[PDB]
Design an enzyme around this catalytic site. Structure first.
Site, PDB file in Angstrom:
ATOM      1  N   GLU A   1       0.761  -1.429   0.147  1.00 57.57           N
ATOM      2  CA  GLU A   1      -0.069   0.068  -0.167  1.00 57.57           C
ATOM      3  C   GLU A   1       1.079   1.317  -0.078  1.00 57.57           C
ATOM      4  O   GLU A   1       0.185   2.723  -0.738  1.00 57.57           O
ATOM      5  CB  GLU A   1      -0.932  -0.207   1.152  1.00 57.57           C
TER       6      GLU A   1
ATOM      7  N   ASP B   1      -6.322   6.731  -4.974  1.00 55.95           N
ATOM      8  CA  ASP B   1      -5.662   5.580  -5.136  1.00 55.95           C
ATOM      9  C   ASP B   1      -6.413   5.095  -6.542  1.00 55.95           C
ATOM     10  O   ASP B   1      -6.424   5.444  -7.167  1.00 55.95           O
ATOM     11  CB  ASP B   1      -6.676   3.694  -3.649  1.00 55.95           C
TER      12      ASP B   1
ATOM     13  N   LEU C   1      -9.050   4.133   3.306  1.00 55.00           N
ATOM     14  CA  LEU C   1     -10.022   4.056   2.152  1.00 55.00           C
ATOM     15  C   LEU C   1     -10.764   5.415   3.005  1.00 55.00           C
ATOM     16  O   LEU C   1     -11.273   5.337   4.321  1.00 55.00           O
ATOM     17  CB  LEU C   1     -10.837   3.578   1.687  1.00 55.00           C
TER      18      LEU C   1
ATOM     19  N   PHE D   1      -8.016  -7.072   3.252  1.00 53.16           N
ATOM     20  CA  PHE D   1      -8.142  -5.222   3.104  1.00 53.16           C
ATOM     21  C   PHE D   1      -8.398  -4.841   2.431  1.00 53.16           C
ATOM     22  O   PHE D   1      -8.763  -3.202   1.849  1.00 53.16           O
ATOM     23  CB  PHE D   1      -5.962  -5.392   3.879  1.00 53.16           C
TER      24      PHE D   1
ATOM     25  N   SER E   1     -12.712 -20.029  -5.526  1.00 47.80           N
ATOM     26  CA  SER E   1     -10.775 -19.539  -5.859  1.00 47.80           C
ATOM     27  C   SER E   1     -11.002 -20.290  -3.715  1.00 47.80           C
ATOM     28  O   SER E   1      -9.933 -20.822  -3.278  1.00 47.80           O
ATOM     29  CB  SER E   1     -10.631 -18.619  -5.219  1.00 47.80           C
TER      30      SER E   1
ATOM     31  N   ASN F   1      -7.260 -19.964 -10.788  1.00 49.45           N
ATOM     32  CA  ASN F   1      -8.870 -19.316 -10.947  1.00 49.45           C
ATOM     33  C   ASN F   1      -8.475 -17.844 -10.066  1.00 49.45           C
ATOM     34  O   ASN F   1      -9.312 -17.172 -10.589  1.00 49.45           O
ATOM     35  CB  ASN F   1      -9.188 -20.199  -8.912  1.00 49.45           C
TER      36      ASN F   1
END
Ligand code: CL
Ligand code: CL
Length: 162
Positions: A11, A20, A32, A104, A117, A132
């Site tokens: 990040e 972002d 965020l 996250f 998945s 996948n």
């Protein structure tokens, strides 16, 4: 390596409000602030999160504090989600960090929709899960990060981050 260093890598750290990869206002280590196009709205959400009039800027400690909260909320979210918890509990510690990272980034909801998945991960079909997982808007939008997290989940090692 651990979850904190891993996400700090993925990040980065910015002390001023920024947008972002999706164009949303964010600050610190991927926190965020809002999906709204209003910078004032974003400034309002920041001051509320910090507890003071920040003027769009925070210190390193403030960013780390939001990050700790965010990491905490991510894990807890997983443990409270009926589709996620069982997968998470079946995994080893490295692979668990890959699940936390995804949540996250994308939110629990988002992650809980990777049905297929999730099942392959639960069954320990590593390679299949990896393929996948790559079939997703997530991977096509942020492929370098997606590759690192996918490899973590596939191998159970921190190699992608060394
Ligand atoms: Cl907050
Ligand atoms: Cl990326």
């Amino acid at each position: 390596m651990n979850i904190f260093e891993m996400l700090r890598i993925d990040e980065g750290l910015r002390l001023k409000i920024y947008k972002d990869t999706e164009g949303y206002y964010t600050i610190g280590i991927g926190h965020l602030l809002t999906k709204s196009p209003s910078l004032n709205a974003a400034k309002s959400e920041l001051d509320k999160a910090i507890g003071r009039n920040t003027n769009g800027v925070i210190t390193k400690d403030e960013a780390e504090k939001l990050f700790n909260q965010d990491v905490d909320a991510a894990v807890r979210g997983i443990l409270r989600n009926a589709k996620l918890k069982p997968v998470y509990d079946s995994l080893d510690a490295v692979r668990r960090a890959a699940a936390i990272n995804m949540v996250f980034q994308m939110g629990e909801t988002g992650v809980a929709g990777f049905t297929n998945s999730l099942r392959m991960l639960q069954q320990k079909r590593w390679d299949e899960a990896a393929v996948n997982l790559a079939k997703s808007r997530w991977y096509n939008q942020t492929p370098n990060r997606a590759k690192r997290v996918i490899t973590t989940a596939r191998t159970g090692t921190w190699d992608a981050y060394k």
